[PDB]
Curated annotation (Swiss-Prot), chain A:
It comes from Methanothermobacter thermautotrophicus (strain ATCC 29096 / DSM 1053 / JCM 10044 / NBRC 100330 / Delta H) (Methanobacterium thermoautotrophicum). The gene is mthK. The keyword Calcium applies. It is a multi-pass membrane protein. It comes from the Archaea. Homotetramer. It is found in: Cell membrane. Ca(2+) binds at D69, E95, E97. Calcium-gated potassium channel. This is Calcium-gated potassium channel MthK. Residues 137-221 form the RCK C-terminal domain. The channel is composed of 4 repeated units, each containing a transmembrane pore part and a gating ring part. The gating ring is composed of eight identical RCK (Regulators of K conductance) domains, in an alternating arrangement of one domain from each of the four subunits and four from the intracellular solution. Two protein interfaces between dimers of RCK domains from the pore-forming subunit and from the intracellular solution hold the ring together. One is called the fixed interface and the other the flexible interface. The flexible interface forms a cleft where calcium binds. Its main location: membrane. The lineage of its organism: Archaea, Methanobacteriati, Methanobacteriota, Methanomada group, Methanobacteria.
Length: 224, 220
């Protein structure tokens, strides 16, 4: 369903570009952004992201997720708490500008924290001789390039449910590179040949559309 | 050879941390930055990154690479221009705050442009259900993860010279999962089994240190 974004910045703008076709509500105090927000395809809700009543009129309750990106560390936390007073289920992803705050966001109830500068800093250190690593990260994330990164859940009653990674041989079968498996908020990279896929497991891979579609079929569940 | 970082920020700080144990010169206008920098193990140079004299003062000429991240893209660009007047060959990596300025930074002379907000925004859109992709990206770029991404060049006369991907059997042989090959200006992700390696090629892989070492010895 719908996604709510609290605040506005270059990150959320790029995020909207990726969420077009999806119903998105942007709640922010700076009306100067209404134009850009509306152009970007999102519904603009003028209001205070740290206020429960405004979060509510922004349709936070029942949202699929709420992305929080406010300049103030304090406001981000107050926003998180406000969201939590409305809906305890909704996934909350918060942007952090300082490493020192990542845990306070966690404490407040954020399910995930994205730190643009940690990522930027590491790409800088990895780009001293060439930019292949930076290129990788950018390519696999560029919505529609030769090969892209995707995640596919292993549905209940999946064809591979109970099968081993070795027995699966997903790469030779589909052509998709398996970079990891997500299970219970934990990512297992390059799992042992004896790792057995289970429903709910999330497969992270890199491949072409055809290869991806092939993976979807290979992971489909045996049900009418 | 040393590395110069122009500007001070959370990004350059994380970079500085990842470069622990290497000679680094940080050039910035605020003396306050001094202490915070000297600690992290970097040498501080009090000066203006947009001023050529101060850039020279920071030892840019001859540097292994120059990382640029100033207040605005305008200043960043001014810095790059400054660096190019000194060393037209030194590698320049610059952070861009806006997608619109990327081209300008490149034109000014930046060899590479990092747009943290474009990456972050993309991760945001991919974390609506879970954060595995975001988790993947931040872990692999960490030089301290158990399984991290690494670059390994094919040395001259390598035994992998002219050998196809298939015949190299690198994953089974070392345990390192190969994600791509860096050759020239292009990056080939998941090269076809019929891809022949060459000296100079850069192999991008992911694995534990042990797996990494096996790949290094195997490529000799």
């Amino acid at each position: 369903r719908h996604v709510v974004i609290c605040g506005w910045s270059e990150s959320t703008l790029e995020c909207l570009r990726e969420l077009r076709g999806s119903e998105v509500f942007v709640l922010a105090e700076d009306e100067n952004v209404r134009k850009k927000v509306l152009r970007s395809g999102a519904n603009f809700v003028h209001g205070d992201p740290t206020r429960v009543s405004d979060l509510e009129k922004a349709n936070v309750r029942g949202a699929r997720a709420v992305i929080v990106d406010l300049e103030s560390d304090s406001e981000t936390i107050h926003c998180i708490l406000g969201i939590r007073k409305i809906d305890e289920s909704v996934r909350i992803i918060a942007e952090a500008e300082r490493y020192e705050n990542i845990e306070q966001l966690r404490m407040a109830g954020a399910d995930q924290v994205i730190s643009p500068f940690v990522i930027s800093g590491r790409l800088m250190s990895r780009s001293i001789d060439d930019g292949y690593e930076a290129m990788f990260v950018q390519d696999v994330l560029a919505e529609e390039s030769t090969r892209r990164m995707v995640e596919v859940p292993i549905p209940e009653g999946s064809k591979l449910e109970g099968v081993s990674v070795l027995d699966a041989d997903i790469h030779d079968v589909t052509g998709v590179i398996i970079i990891g498996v997500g299970r219970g908020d934990e990512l297992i990279i390059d799992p042992p040949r004896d790792y057995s896929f289970r429903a709910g497991d999330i497969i992270l891979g890199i491949g072409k559309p055809e290869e991806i579609e092939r993976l979807k079929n290979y992971i489909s569940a045996l049900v009418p």
